[PDB]
């Protein structure tokens, strides 16, 4: 499994937005959470999520705290409801990638079966195009072990809903 | 004079998602939100309970974890699915609802049918026990009734939803 494409369930977009809005998230501040679904295939399917408690220092990007116990404890409970919806990565409200993201990403590698997906949900909705960007971390050992470079690979994504949600979405807009 | 239950975007989608996932089995979860005036119940969010086939430790675990992320709302009732069996309360359900009503008189039992629910029609109802014991001391019969259902979305949620295709 070398990833190529990503689908997002409308419920995840709404969950990220609701998470953002309910935490009175101030300007310059971001909310962060866990995404769930399927990432064993070339197309990654993001079908669920949950919110994380997360703190970072606005004046020093090297300092942030993710509650590892919280990830595991909440993940435990998710498996008891749907064992098919696995931990596949994380999300935040961005709007852009931050300096700590490569390192936060590393921590999620402990919880995922494959290379973690980072999903940025633009909760300000100012692009007017798609309010999501999908990233995967890649590293390349260039020049034979004098240096390696690590960066985020942008994956195209699309909003895809299963029937149950299709019905919900149309009911809400109509 | 009619009391309405206002169900949010995510609460609706979670209920439908969880109902469909459980087919052919019934599923269940708790509804979170708030009671306002006599005519208004808001269901802001929901969470699934594990297949028992009402775990207190799971519930308390979830409530405490949700509160750490700004989901502070009280339990205002519960939902369950009737995959292909329409909307009603069994005698086990009445008993379940009875325990919810000992905590909040205005507690609501939502029932969804994920099989009959189809594009253009969500098969769903909200129930509350009929008041008996208006003549019981403190020291031909229907057991429940329906409440009207409606839906709420913020303007932001509305803009978000436009992105589905």
């Amino acid at each position, epitope marked *: 499994l070398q990833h190529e494409k990503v689908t997002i369930a409308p419920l995840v977009l709404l969950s990220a937005l609701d998470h953002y809005e309910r935490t*009175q998230t101030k300007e310059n501040k971001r909310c962060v959470g866990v995404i769930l679904g399927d990432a064993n295939s070339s197309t990654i399917r993001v079908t669920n999520s949950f919110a994380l408690p997360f703190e970072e220092d606005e004046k020093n990007s090297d300092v942030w705290f993710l509650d590892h116990n919280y990830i595991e404890n909440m993940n435990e409970m998710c498996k008891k409801i749907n064992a098919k919806e696995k931990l596949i990565g994380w999300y935040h409200s961005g709007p852009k990638l931050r300096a700590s993201d490569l390192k936060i990403n590393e921590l999620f590698k402990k919880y995922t079966q494959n290379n973690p997906l980072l999903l940025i949900v633009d909760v300000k909705q100012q692009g007017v195009g798609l309010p999501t960007d999908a990233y995967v971390a890649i590293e390349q050992v260039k020049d034979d072990g004098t240096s390696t470079e690590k960066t985020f690979l942008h994956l195209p994504c699309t909003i895809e809903a299963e029937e149950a949600e299709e019905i919900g979405v149309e009911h809400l807009l109509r | 004079t009619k009391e309405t239950v206002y169900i949010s975007s995510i609460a609706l989608l979670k209920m439908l998602k969880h109902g469909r996932a459980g087919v052919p089995m019934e599923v269940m979860g708790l509804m979170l939100g708030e009671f*306002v*005036d006599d005519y208004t119940v808001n269901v802001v969010d929901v969470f699934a309970m594990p297949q028992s086939g009402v775990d207190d430790v799971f519930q308390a675990k979830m409530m405490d974890m949700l509160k750490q992320t700004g989901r502070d709302q009280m339990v205002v009732g519960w939902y369950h699915s009737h995959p292909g069996f329409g909307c009603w309360l069994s005698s086990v359900d009445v008993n379940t609802q009875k325990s919810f009503e000992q905590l909040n008189s205005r507690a609501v039992a939502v029932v969804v049918d994920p099989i009959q629910s189809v594009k253009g029609k969500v098969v769903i109802d909200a129930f509350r026990l009929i008041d008996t014991g208006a003549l019981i001391n403190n020291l031909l019969n229907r057991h429940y009734y329906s409440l009207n259902i409606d839906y709420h979305k913020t303007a932001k949620e509305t803009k978000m939803l436009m992105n589905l295709h």
Partner: nanobody
Amino acid sequence: VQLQESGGGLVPAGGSLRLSCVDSGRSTVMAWFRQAPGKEREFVATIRWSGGNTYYADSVKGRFTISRDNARNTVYLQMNSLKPEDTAVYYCAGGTYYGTLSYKYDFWGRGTQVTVSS
């Protein structure tokens, strides 16, 4: 900015104030919230434009009255028997959610300062 608050200012403990909020570009629900320094925004009162159903925070019941005037696109808060703990910036908000959760409102006014003397 769609919502415009007015009234309010310094008032002595026990006195009265009337807040008004004008909506310039027509939501089904209006509310007042308030925020003091170091505290979270706190729900005060909510009202339906059509019908006029009202709901109040417990700390404000029987002292404050939220009303609306449909013709003039205006919502009021009559604040009586004021106390030092009522000191805050008062905001009106509109939306379609009838309740207490600030984040379920769609738009806000810039706010008006209310000060009750200790």
